[model samples]
Target: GLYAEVLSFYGHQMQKLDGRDFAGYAATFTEDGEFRHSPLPAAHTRAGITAVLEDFHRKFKIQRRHWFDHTALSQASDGSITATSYCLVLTVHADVKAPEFGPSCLVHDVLVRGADGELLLRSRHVTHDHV
Candidate 1:
């Protein structure tokens, strides 16, 4: 029942990020959302989240497709949603026709509903598999 909506929400959220809509991507978060990618500083605000995404583009190529699989969505006892998925970052080095793998990680998200009943990510944590 709720899984459909949750999956759809993620579809929109991830696409915005993959398309480099940094602001839009960050907007999917709650006002006080937290984003923690292991080994890096956590983004505790939407502005900070946007900055982190922008830094990714400024430091690298045009496209880094973020892929997620094996997602498990569950509702917590406190009415929050937990979304856990495996992430794969794939990159294409067009300058030299090289396909580079960015990183493989497990991504976790705590989702909550906004005033309008739309889902917003309350927190997102990424754990790199090899690093």
Candidate 2:
């Protein structure tokens, strides 16, 4: 049940991202959630994360599709769930071929229960394959 819940949350998160629903996407994280990725500044809060995602959407001005697989989830000593997965970002453009590869990365997420007793993303550390 935990796996199902976590994976469902994961899918919902990805869908929000693909739809560029910034606020909705950010709501998936805990209040103190963090997102750390290489070659980019880290985001430490819901507002910060929303800003980062908003900026990316504004600058890119293109649709994005995310691909994720090979996920492993385990409960940590702190009772939080740790998930690791491979992520691929693909670009969507009417003029270009479908699913143009953008970046490949390893995503590590720390999921913790929020005040509402629902799992929320506490932190995400992303290690990119390409600079």
Candidate 3:
């Protein structure tokens, strides 16, 4: 049951991002959520995270969807959930005929339930394939 709920919530996050709803996507996290990309400093505020993603969207001007495969979920003693997934960056460029898959990353996330009983991410560490 926890796994199903977590999976659904994860999909909801993806849906927000795929729709280019950067603000909403950031809202899926905790108030002090942390988002870490390889070389970028960790984003601990929703506003900062939103701005970061919006910047990417502005520069790329393409549809980028977050797809996670082989996701594993487990609950910790503190009732928080840990989810590990392989992230495949699926992109659709404006000038391209077909969608192209970009580089992949292994993502680990710590999720917790809010006071409203909804899932929220506390932290997400994305170790990209940067070699």
Candidate 4:
């Protein structure tokens, strides 16, 4: 029952990202939520998350991402849940210099329901295949 809601939320987030709707992507997190790209270890907080999406828009301008074989694990206890999913990101960038940033990859996510009842991120492990 719990997993249903969590998965719904996660699915929505990924779909919005694939749609290139940065604002919608950012809306999935709490006010002080966090996001991390495995290739980029640096953790991006709420504003930071927004900034990263903004940067992506400024750089790529356009993208099309696809995710599949999504799986979520239950790590919830005492009001917190964690999940991991694989996303196949296919992007068509507007800038040539921003190449090598397209096609797709497998991304692991660390999603949590924060103490304040807002879903947050703990970490993400991104894996790339056959570039």
Candidate 5:
């Protein structure tokens, strides 16, 4: 659980990034949610997604960004939602802030909700094909 917290911290930190609206970004999650670890860029629930968006604003000061090429959503046996999507993280620097854009291969995720209604990050299996 220690390691899991560390990774989840990244997801949390990513929400407070400086370049975007932290309030809006953090709005995607369920107030209490978890983010799993993986290179493919998966999130557990609305709260986790919101956390990542906030961090994206805090860390990178993202001028502009987008997530495209989503394949589909599949429900796991445990009732978790999962999907494959291409992440295009484009940002402009504080100085030049011009033509700054790039893409990252990320896996869309849906964590399973427990009986208590807590959303736990089920997966995040990011790939390196785009980024």
Candidate 6:
């Protein structure tokens, strides 16, 4: 199923991010992809996305584990797909035996087939838990 494929692709992208492979993570998005995170400027291109990741890495020195649950996908008439997932962010530190839970976020992504016929994120917005 297409939804299953989308889920697999999303999981692979998260793995790349967890592995700190910035290039691999960036490749998961479209050439003109957009990323918006709280307390950061929007990134509109792959290079911009790299900049965001670089800045984030500079500010944080911990490993991340993304736990996704209740994921759902729907396709639009324009051949675009919207995937929404609940994500729990866990932080791993060298001094701790277990990862510390951070935030529960809702990840909304807009995806489309790229020139190579692979799913690519056109936009991604992650919203933190209601405060």
Model 4: residue 128 alpha-carbon error in angstroms: 2.4
lDDT digits (tens) for residues 1-131 of candidate 5: 43343335334534443335445434433454444434435555656655665654455433664445544556778677565656565666567747466656575555555588544444455555643
What is the clash count for each candidate, in the order shown?
0, 0, 0, 0, 21, 0
Q: Sorted on lDDT, highest at the top, how do the candidates line up?
A: 6, 1, 3, 2, 4, 5
Q: What would the per-residue lDDT of candidate 3 be over residues 66-115, giving only the tens digit for each residue?
A: 88888898888999988999998988888887889867899999999858
The numbered model that scores best in TM-score is: 6
Write the candidate numbers in order of decreasing TM-score.
6, 1, 2, 3, 4, 5
Better of 1 and 5 by TM-score: 1
Task: Please give, for residues 1-131, the per-residue lDDT of candidate 2 as tens digits.
Answer: 88788778889999998997888888999888798856576898999999888776776736788888888999899989899999998887767766579689999999998577798999998888876
Can you write out model 4's per-residue Cα lDDT over 1-131, one digit (the tens) per residue?
66677667677877887776766776776556566654555546566777877765665455565655667676756445556666666555677545344435565655666556656556555566764
Worst 10 residues of 5 by lDDT: 1-10
Off by over 4 Å in 5: 1-19, 36-62, 93-98, 111-131
- On a 0 to 1 TM-score scale, where does candidate 3 land against the true structure? 0.89
| Position 103, candidate 6: lDDT | 87
Residue 5 displacement (Å), model 1: 1.5
> Each candidate's lDDT (Cα)?
0.86, 0.85, 0.85, 0.63, 0.51, 0.86
Residue 102 of model 1, lDDT score: 62
Model 6 RMSD, rounded to 1 decimal: 1.6
RMSD of each: 1.7, 1.7, 1.7, 4.9, 9.7, 1.6
Model 5 per-residue lDDT at 17:
36
* Segments of candidate 3 deviating more than 4 angstroms: none
Worst 10 residues of 1 by lDDT: 55-64
Pairwise TM-score winner, candidates 1 and 4: 1
lDDT at 18, model 4: 71
lDDT string for model 6 (18-108, tens) is 8888888989898898998764668988889988888877867488888898889888888999889999988988888788896899999
